[PDB]
Amino acid sequence: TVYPLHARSTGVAARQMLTDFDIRNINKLSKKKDIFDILSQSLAPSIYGHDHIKKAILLMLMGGVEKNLENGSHLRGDINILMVGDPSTAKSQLLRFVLNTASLAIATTGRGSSGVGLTAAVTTDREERRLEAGAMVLADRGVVCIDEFDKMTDVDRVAIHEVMEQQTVTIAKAGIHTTLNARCSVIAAANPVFGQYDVNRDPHQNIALPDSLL
Amino acid sequence: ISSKPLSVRQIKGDFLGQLITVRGIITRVSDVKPAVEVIAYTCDQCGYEVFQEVNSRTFTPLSECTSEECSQNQTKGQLFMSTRASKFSAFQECKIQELSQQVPVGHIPRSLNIHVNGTLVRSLSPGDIVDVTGIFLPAPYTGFKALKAGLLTETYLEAQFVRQHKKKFASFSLTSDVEERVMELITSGDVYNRLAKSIAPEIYGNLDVKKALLLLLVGGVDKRVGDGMKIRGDINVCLMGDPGVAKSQLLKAICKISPRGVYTTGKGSSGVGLTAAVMKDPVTDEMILEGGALVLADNGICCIDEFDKMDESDRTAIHEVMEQQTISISKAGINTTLNARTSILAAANPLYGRYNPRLSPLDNINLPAALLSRFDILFLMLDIPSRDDDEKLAEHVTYVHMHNKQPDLDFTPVE
Amino acid sequence: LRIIWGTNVSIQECTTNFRNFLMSFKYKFRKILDEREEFINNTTDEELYYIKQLNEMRELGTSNLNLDARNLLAYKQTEDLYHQLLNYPQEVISIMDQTIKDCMVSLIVDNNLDYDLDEIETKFYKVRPYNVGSCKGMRELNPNDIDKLINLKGLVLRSTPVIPDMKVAFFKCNVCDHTMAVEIDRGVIQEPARCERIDCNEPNSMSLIHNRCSFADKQVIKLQETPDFVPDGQTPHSISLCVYDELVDSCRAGDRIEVTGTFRSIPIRANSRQRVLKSLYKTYVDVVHVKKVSDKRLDVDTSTIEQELMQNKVDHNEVEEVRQITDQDLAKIREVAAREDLYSLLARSIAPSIYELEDVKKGILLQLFGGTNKTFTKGGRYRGDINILLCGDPSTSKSQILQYVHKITPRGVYTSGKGSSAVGLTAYITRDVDTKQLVLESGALVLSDGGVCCIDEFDKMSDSTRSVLHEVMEQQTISIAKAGIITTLNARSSILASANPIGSRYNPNLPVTENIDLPPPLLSRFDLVYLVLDKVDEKNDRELAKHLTNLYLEDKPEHISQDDVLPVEFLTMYISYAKEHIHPIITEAAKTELVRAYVGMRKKRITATTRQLESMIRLAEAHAKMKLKNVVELEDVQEAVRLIRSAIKDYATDPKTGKIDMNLVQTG
Ligand SMILES: Nc1ncnc2c1ncn2[C@@H]1O[C@H](COP(=O)(O)OP(=O)(O)O)[C@@H](O)[C@H]1O
Ligand SMILES: Nc1ncnc2c1ncn2[C@@H]1O[C@H](COP(=O)(O)OP(=O)(O)O)[C@@H](O)[C@H]1O
Ligand SMILES: Nc1ncnc2c1ncn2[C@@H]1O[C@H](COP(=O)(O)OP(=O)(O)O)[C@@H](O)[C@H]1O
Ligand code: BEF
Ligand code: BEF
Ligand code: BEF
Ligand SMILES: [Mg+2]
Ligand SMILES: [Mg+2]
Ligand SMILES: [Mg+2]
Ligand SMILES: [Zn+2]
Ligand SMILES: [Zn+2]
C-alpha cells in the first residue's frame, strides 16, 4: 500500500471525507444571510480585526472559475492578495494560517526561494537534463504563501509575472522547450521600504514595487 | 481504440503490442542513419550469398560460411560483408513529449521514444504538435543490471502514420478542396479586416495591432539580388505599452495561429535558450549542436514577452537575428554560423512601468536607436481612460465571461 | 551481358563508350549543352579536348586526370556513363582508370615517341571525377544512397595527423625464417596457420612483424556542412571526410572546399565489448576530388602557403591550390589597369549593391589587396595586412559590406560581438567523438589566417574579449600559453570591424574619440577608422530610395547602377594576380612625402602615432599594387593620406576641440 501524506508546504493535497451529515450541515449553514461574515470571522479568531483581509483570504481559498476558450486563450480564475504594512501587524500570522488551512499550500520566504527556487528550472541531471518543479509548479491548484515580498530580488520577481498572470512557466532553456502548468494563487506580505508606512509620502514611494507587479 | 489519441501517461503496459495514437509535442529528432535489417555476407569460395537477419541494437558477424557447402564440404569459405548487397532502412529515434493540457495537477511532462523507420523518416521535426500512430512494441531492458528484477522491458513506439495538428506553411498545395475553402474566404469580402478581427476575438478595441500582427504572420518578400545582398523580407513587430492592455494574450493568440513559434519570456531562461551550444546525441553518438529557442523558431514567430526585462546579452544576439537572419557563434568548441530566419514579436513595458507623458517617448521607450531601428512597427498601446471606451471594454469582457464567445453577434470569427 | 552482378555496368560497353568519349569530345558540345552558343569560340572548341589534355598529362608526367562529369553528360553516346559512374563509382572508376591507361599507351605508340614504353608503364593512373550534380545537402541522404558519388562543400574545421594504413602484412615463421606476403581484401589480411611453402607445419608458427608490413597514408578531415538549402530549424551538421594517397595534408583548416567522394556506411564496435557491432551504421564520406579554387572567391594567398607548396610538389598532390591565369585574361588585366578610372571602377565593383559609400568601398578594396609582405631575412617580418574599423550610425550598410567581404575573401570568418569569447577565438581544446581523445582546434582568428575576419558589432564585444585582438592586430601572430599548449601561432588575419557609436547614434556634441569609445591602444592599431554618418540630405536620400525601390521592381533583379562594374570573376582574377605576383617597393619621393605627412599630422582627437605611419606605408603599398605598379610614387602616398583624412572626416572635424561641424560633414 502507498499512502501519500499531506504535510505543510508539500505538493500532496489535503482531501477530507464528507459524510452525509457534514454535507447536510454545510447546506443548512449556507442558507444564512450572514454566512460570509460567519465564515470570515472563523479564519483567524486569534487575530483581532482585519475583517476585510480575512474576507479576502476566504475568497482566495474559494477562488474563482478559470475560463478556457476555443481559440486557446486562458483567463485567470485565481485571485492574488498582497499585504503591505507596519511590523507586527499579524501579516506573517495570516500567511501561516493560510498555509495551515488550505488543502494545498506552499510557504516560501523572501530570498531563500530564488527565481530558480520559484517557478522551475532544469537540473541538468547526469541521469539527462531533467526538469525539477519549483515552488509554484508544485502549488498547482493551490496557494503560495510568500513572506517578506519586499526583500525579494528584482530578478526573482521578474520571473513571477508569467506565473501570476498566464499561470504557466515556460522553460525554453538548454534545448528544452516546455510550458509547465502553474495555476497558483499567490499571497504575499511585505513591509514598506521605510519600515513604517509614511502618510506624508505618496503610496508609490512607500511600496516601491513595479507597477506591473502591483 | 486506435482512433482515440492517448497521452504518454495513459500508455500503460496493457497497450503493449496494439496500434495506438499518442498525442504530444516533439522535442528531439535524430538524424537519419542506416539501420541494418538483414546484413549480406559474400563467400567467394562457394559463391553463395549468406544473409544474417539483425533484430536488435547490436549483432555479431560471422567467420565460417554457414551455407550448405562450406559447412558440409571440407572447404571452409571466408565470408565478407557487402554493404550494397545488404538491406538497410532510414531510421530516426524521435522523442515525443506530453503536452501541458495532458499533464495532471502538479506533475511534469514525461516522454516516450519513437522509432521512425522506412520512408516515414523526416516527417517529424522538433516543436511539432502531432498525433503519431504506431505499434507499442517492447524492447529488452537496457539500463543497469542491478536494478533489473525479472524480464524488464523498455518500450518504444514504431511509427506508422503521422498527423500534424498545425500544418506547415512550406507544405501548401492549392488542391481543389483547399481552393474551394480559400475562394469561399475570398467571396466573403473584406478579407483583410475580417482576418485582422479574427485573431483573438476575445480582445476588444485593439484592431490596428491585430492588423499589424496579421501583417507579421503574412511576411514580406525576401530579396536576394544577383550580387549577393539579401533583404530580410520579414517584419519585426513590437508592442510597447502599459500593463494590463492584453499584450501577452495577443502574443499567445499569435502563438496559437502560427504553426511554428516559441513563447520565450522573461530573463535568465532566455540566456541559454539562445546559446545554441554543442552536445552528444545518445542515438548516433554524433556531437550535434543543440539549437536554442530562436533556431527552433526558424521560419516562425519568436513571440518574445517581457522584452524590456530581458538580459542585454541576449539583446546583442537579437540585433543580428533581426538584421542578418543568422546567428554567428565563435565560442569555445563552436565556430559556425547558425541559420535562424525568424520574425520577432516583442511585448514589453516602457521604462518606469506605466508610460509617463512628461518624459519624451524615446526616453521612455528605452530602446537604443540601433535596436529600435530593426522594429518595423512599434506600437504604443497607451492606456488612456475614458467613460465610453472603458464601459465598452467592460461590457465586452463581461460578455466573454458570461458566454465563452466573442460578443459580436453578426461577426464571424474565422476558424 | 557479362555485367557485374548487382550493377548495370558492362565492362566492354563501358570501356568502348569511355574510349569514344575520350577520343571524340569537343568542348563545343558542352557549350551547346550549357547554352553557350552565343559564347562559342571554335578557335579552341573544335580541337580534341581530352586528347590534348592527355598529351599535356603525358608531357608533364602527372598521374591524375581530373575528369568533369558534365563533360560525360554532354557527349550523347556516353550519357549513360554519367549515370553509371554516379551510381557505381568504384567499379566505373576502376574501368576508367584502365581505359585511360590503354588510351594513353595508344596515344604514345601512335605518335611513335622514341623513349622506352616500359619506363612509364609502371604507374597508376587515377581518374578524379567532380561536379557530379548539385549539392543536394547531406542530411537528405537516405540509406539507399550508399556508395554513390556525391558532391559536398563546406568549411574544414580540423584535420587528423596522417594515420598509416596496413595493406600488405609481413609474417615470419620464427624457426624457418620464411617471410610471408598477404594482401588486403575488404580490410582483412588472412593469418596463415601453416607456412606458405612446405618447410614446416605448426599451429602457431609465424608471428606478425608490423614494421616490415606495407602501410598507406590515411587522414581524417572534419568538414562542417554549408548547404545552399537548409531545412527549417536545422543546425549546421558535421561529416568526417577520409582522404588517401596524395590528398593527404592537401586541405588545411578553415578552407572552404568543394569535395566529391563516395558515401560510405560502416558498422561500429561496442565499447570494450569484443567484436559486437551496433546495428545503426556510422556514415562517412570518401574523397576523390577537392576543388579549393572557386571563381566566386579570391584565390588563396601564395605567401601563406609558400612553404607548403614545396611539400605539395614533393607529394605531387595535383590539387589545384591556386587558379592559373590565362594569357588573354592577363592581357585583359593589363588593359583594365590601363584604364583612367581604374580606382573608381574597382572600388564600385566591390559590393555593387551598396550605394554612395565610395570612400568606405575604397578602403575595403585596399584591404583586399594588402601591403607588401616584407621578409626581414636577418630576423622578424612585416605583414601587409590592413585592418579597418567602421564606427557608424545605424542602417548605413556596414553589415552588408562585411557580408560581401566575407563572401569574397578566401578564408574568412564572420563573428558578432557577444557570440564570441577569448577562448572562442585563437585556439582551444576539445574532445572528438571518434577518437575519444583530446585534440586541438582553431578559433576564428586562426581560421581567418591569410584572410579577413569580419568582426561585427565591435562595441558590444567585451573588453576582455577584445584584449586578445592586440597581439594578432600588431605583429600578426598569436602566442598562447595555456593548460597543455605552449606555442606561437601565426594568424596573418586582417581584421574588419563594424561598430555603432556609443548611444547607437553619433552625438555631434561629443568628440570623435568619445563617440567611438575605444581604448587608445586598440583604437590606434586600426589603420583606417571610418565615421560613417547618416545625415538627412534630401537629394542623397531621394537617390538612395530610388535605388532601393528599383531593386524591388522584378523578382531576380539585375543591379540598378548608372556605371558599369567588373564581373566578380574578373575582379577575383585581378586581385589574386596583383597580390601574388606584384610586390611593390617604396621610393625616395614617397619616403619624403610619408615623413612630411606624418610630421604634419602630429601637430581631444586621437593623436597620431607610429602606427599611423605604418598604416600610411601599407596603404601606399596597397595602392601601388592596385595600379599593377612594382614601385610606389608620391601621388599614391598623397592618396593614402587623403583617404586617412576622409575616413575620420578630418575636414569637418574642429581642429582643437575634436567636435564635428554638421554643415560641412555632408558627403556625395
Ligand atoms: N491584530 C492582532 N491580533 C492579534 N495578535 C496580533 C495582532 N497583531 C499582531 N499580533 C501578534 O503580534 C505578533 C507579530 O505578528 P507577525 O505576523 O509576526 O507580524 P508581522 O506583520 O511583522 O509579520 C504575533 O505574535 C501576533 O500574534
Ligand atoms: N482589450 C482587452 N480585451 C480583453 N481583455 C483585456 C483587454 N485588456 C486587458 N484585458 C485583460 O487584462 C488582463 C491582462 O492580460 P495580459 O495580456 O497579461 O496583459 P499585459 O501583458 O498587457 O500586462 C487579462 O485578463 C486580459 O484578458
Ligand atoms: N547606403 C546604402 N546603400 C545600400 N544599402 C543601404 C544603404 N544604407 C542602408 N542600406 C540598406 O539598409 C539596411 C541596413 O544595412 P545594415 O548593414 O543591416 O545596417 P547596419 O549598418 O546598422 O549594420 C540593409 O538592408 C542595406 O541594404
Ligand atoms: F515585522 Be513584520 F514580520 F512585517
Ligand atoms: F502587466 Be503586462 F504583462 F505588460
Ligand atoms: F544599426 Be547597425 F547594425 F550599425
Ligand atoms: Mg512578517
Ligand atoms: Mg505581459
Ligand atoms: Mg550591423
Ligand atoms: Zn561458403
Ligand atoms: Zn615455418
Does residue C69 sit in the same domain as residue C215? no
Neighbours of chain C (3+ CB pairs under 8 A): B
Ligand nearest to the CA of B224: 3
Alpha-carbon distance of B373 to B377, in angstroms, equals 10
Alpha-carbon distance of C319 to C243, in angstroms, equals 13
Resolution for the entry shown, Å: 3.8
Rg (CA), chain A: 19
Listing DSSP states for chain A in one string gives -------TTSSS-------HHHHHHHHHHTTSTTHHHHHHHHH-SSS-S-HHHHHHHHHHHH----EE-TTS-EE-----EEEE--TTSSHHHHHHHHHHHSSSEEEE-SSSS-TTTSSEEE--------EEE-HHHHTTTEEEEEE-GGGS-HHHHHTHHHHHHT-EEE--BTTB--EEE--EEEEEEE--TTSS--SSS-HHHHH---TTT-
Q: Whose CA is nearest to atom 24 of ligand 2?
A: B246
B267 and A155 within 8 Å at the Cβ level: the answer is yes
Rg (CA), chain B: 28
CB contact at 8 A, C518 and C462: no
Of C308, C490, C279, which Cα lies nearest the Cα of B87? C279
CB contact at 8 A, B26 and B71: no
Neighbours of chain A (3+ CB pairs under 8 A): B
Does residue C47 sit in the same domain as residue C116? yes
Does residue C123 sit in the same domain as residue C243? no
Query: How many degrees, rounded to 5, is the angle at CA C392 between CA C387 and CA C397?
Result: 85
3-state secondary structure of C647: helix
Strand bridging mode C415-416 / B79-81? unpaired
Q: Cα of B252 to ligand 5 centre, how many Å?
A: 13
Sequence-ordered alpha helix ranges (H) in C338-431: 342-348, 358-369, 398-408
Residue C243, Cβ neighbours under 10 Å: how many?
25
Does residue C159 sit in the same domain as residue C281? yes
User: Residue for cell digits 493560510?
Assistant: A98
Which residue ranges of B make up the annotated binding site? 204, 244, 246-248, 349, 374
Ligand 6: atom nearest CA of C393 is 4
CB contact at 8 A, A113 and A105: no
User: Please, what sign has the CA dihedral across residues C348, C353, C359, C360?
Assistant: negative
Residue C437 CB burial class (10 angstroms; 0-12, 13-18, ≥19): exposed
3-state secondary structure of C547: helix
Q: What are phi and psi of B91, to 5 degrees?
A: -130, 145
The beta-carbon neighbor of B306 closest among A137, A140, A161 is A161
Length of chain C: 668
Which residue ranges of A make up the annotated binding site for ATP? 85-92
The beta-carbon neighbor of B56 closest among C273, C279, C394 is C279
**Terminal C-alpha separation, chain A:** 46
Q: Cα of B253 to ligand 2 centre, how many Å?
A: 12
Kindly state the cell numbers that stand for C497.
Answer: 570591424
Kindly state the cell numbers that stand for C205.
Answer: 608458427
Q: How many CA atoms lie within 13 A of A156 on its CB side?
A: 22
Strand bridging mode B129-140 / B19-28? antiparallel
The beta-carbon neighbor of C143 closest among B81, B90, B370 is B90
Q: Strand B345-347's sheet: what is its strand order?
A: B304-305, B345-347, B237-239, B377-379
The number of angstroms, rounded, from the C-alpha of C392 to the middle of its chain's C-alpha atoms is 30
Alpha-carbon distance of A120 to A135, in angstroms, equals 7
Kindly state the cell numbers that stand for C334.
Answer: 593589363
Does residue C129 sit in the same domain as residue C140? no
CB contact at 8 A, C157 and C236: no
Ligand 4: atom nearest CA of A87 is 1
Residue B236, Ramachandran bin (φ over 0: left; ψ between -120 and 50: alpha; else beta): beta
Alpha-carbon distance of A171 to A133, in angstroms, equals 11
Residue C183, Cβ neighbours under 10 Å: how many?
10
Kindly state the cell numbers that stand for B295.
Answer: 533556431
Asked whether C and A share 3 or more beta-carbon pairs under 8 angstroms, the answer is no
Alpha-carbon distance of C390 to C645, in angstroms, equals 15
Kindly state the cell numbers that stand for B345.
Answer: 514579436
User: Residue for cell digits 589566417?
Assistant: C449
Q: Whose CA is nearest to atom 1 of ligand 4?
A: A87
Name the minimum distance, in Å, from the CA of B301 to any CA of chain C.
Answer: 12
- A88 CB near ligand 1 (under 6 Å): yes
Does residue C142 sit in the same domain as residue C250? yes
Q: Cα of C499 to ligand 6 centre, how many Å?
A: 7
User: Please, what sign has the CA dihedral across residues C242, C248, C249, C252?
Assistant: negative
Alpha-carbon distance of C451 to C368, in angstroms, equals 9
Amino acid at C147: D
Residue C478, Cβ neighbours under 10 Å: how many?
22
The beta-carbon neighbor of A177 closest among B108, B293, B405 is B293
Containing H/E element for B181?
A: helix B176-187
Q: What are phi and psi of B409, to 5 degrees?
A: -70, -50
Does residue C212 sit in the same domain as residue C104? no
Strand bridging mode B230-231 / B326-328? unpaired
Does residue C22 sit in the same domain as residue C124? yes
Alpha-carbon distance of C32 to C42, in angstroms, equals 12
Q: Considering only residues 68 to 97 of chain B, which have any Cβ-Cβ distance to chain A shorter than 8 Å?
A: 97
Query: How many degrees, rounded to 5, is the angle at CA C547 between CA C546 and CA C551?
Result: 115
Kindly state the cell numbers that stand for C191.
Answer: 593469418
Q: Strand A81-84's sheet: what is its strand order?
A: A81-84, A184-190, A142-147, A105-108
Q: Considering only residues 188 to 217 of chain B, which have any Cβ-Cβ distance to chain C shorter than 8 Å?
A: none
* Chain B contact set for C428 (CB, 8 A): 332-333
Tell me the CA distances in angstroms from A169 to A115, A140, C456, one per residue in order.
12, 11, 35
Dihedral angle over CA of C548, C554, C555, C556, nearest 10: -80
Rg (CA), chain C: 30
* Chain B contact set for A67 (CB, 8 A): 400-401, 404
Does residue C47 sit in the same domain as residue C60? yes
Does residue C112 sit in the same domain as residue C195? no
Does residue C162 sit in the same domain as residue C188? yes
Does residue C33 sit in the same domain as residue C169? no
Strand bridging mode B58-59 / C277-286? antiparallel
Q: How many CA atoms lie within 13 A of C485 on its CB side?
A: 18
Dihedral angle over CA of C394, C397, C399, C401, nearest 10: -150
Sequence-ordered alpha helix ranges (H) in B59-175: 68-72
Give me the total of CB pairs closer than 8 Å, taking one residue from chain B and one from chain C: 219
Range of the domain at C59: 1-134
Query: How many degrees, rounded to 5, is the angle at CA C505 between CA C668 and CA B222?
Result: 75
3-state secondary structure of C22: helix
User: Residue for cell digits 570591424?
Assistant: C497
CB contact at 8 A, B344 and B299: no
Containing H/E element for C56?
A: helix C49-60
- Please, which residues have CB within 8 angstroms of residue B45's CB and are 6 or more apart in sequence? B65, B70, B75, B76, B77, B78
Of B228, B205, A141, A123, which Cα lies nearest the Cα of C559? B228
Letter string b/e over residues C248-287, b meaning 16 or more CB atoms within 10 A of that residue's CB = bbbbbbbbbbbbbbbbebebbeeeeeeeebbbbbbbbbbb
Ligand 3: atom nearest CA of C399 is 17
